Structure 1
Amino acid sequence: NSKYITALKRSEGQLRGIQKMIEGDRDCADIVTQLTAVRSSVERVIEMIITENLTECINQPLDDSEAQKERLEKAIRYLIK
């Protein structure tokens, strides 16, 4: 949905800002702090997509038993990777 796109757009804005921080010779801690914030915000989108995908696989199973087996397995594999 459209909540991810806002969050991705922000991360993208922060990434170009961090570019300006390196190209202006800012220090290790200021740069790492911002990069970590970008990293967590991307990870949070990843987690939300994985969570929603696994929820829908559990909550709305396919008719075919083997198909539903393979679909849950793929959803869970993302959870533990």
Structure 2
Amino acid sequence: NSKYITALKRSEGQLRGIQKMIEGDRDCADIVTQLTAVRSSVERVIEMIITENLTECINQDDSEAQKERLEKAIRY
């Protein structure tokens, strides 16, 4: 649980860093590179919740477990 808190705190702080870069008129490729890392850290939190939710979801839903399986095959 609190793993996901600290990871989302990292993503929140990185978005504050990117705001300070846009304020500093930093280069748009440097902006896009850091925004890309934020996108990836949020997706990593999504992957970790869907992994944990699958591994208790098979020990038990309805047809929302196919969403979890769809997600894991698409990320694979």
CA contact (8 A) 1:54 1:75 kept: no
The structure, 1 or 2, with the larger RCO (C-alpha pairs under 8 Å, 6+ apart) is: 2
Name the count of aligned residue pairs.
76
Give aligned-pair identity as a percent: 100
TM-score scaled by structure 2? 0.75
RMSD of aligned alpha carbons: 4.6
TM-score by length of 1: 0.71
The gaps in structure 1 that reach 5 residues or longer are: none
CA contact (8 A) 1:18 1:35 kept: yes
Find the structure with the greater CA-based Rg. Answer: 1
Contiguous gaps of at least 5 residues in structure 2: none
Q: CA deviation at 1:29?
A: 1.1
Q: Residue 65 and residue 48 in structure 1: after superposition, are their counterparts in 2 closer, same or farther (change >3 A)?
A: closer
Where 2:58 maps in the other structure, the secondary structure is helix
Contact 1:57-1:72 at 8 Å conserved across structures? no
Contact 2:54 2:65 in 1 (8 A): no
Asked if 1 retains the 8 angstrom alpha-carbon contact of 2:15 and 2:38, the reply is yes
* CA deviations over 1:43-65 (Å, ceiling 9, x no partner): 000111011111111134xx999
Contact 2:18/2:31 (8 A) holds in 1: yes
Relative to 1, partners in 2 of residues 1:57 and 1:26: Cα closer, same or farther, differing over 3 Å?
same
1:56 and 1:72, CA in 2 relative to 1: closer, same or farther beyond 3 A? farther
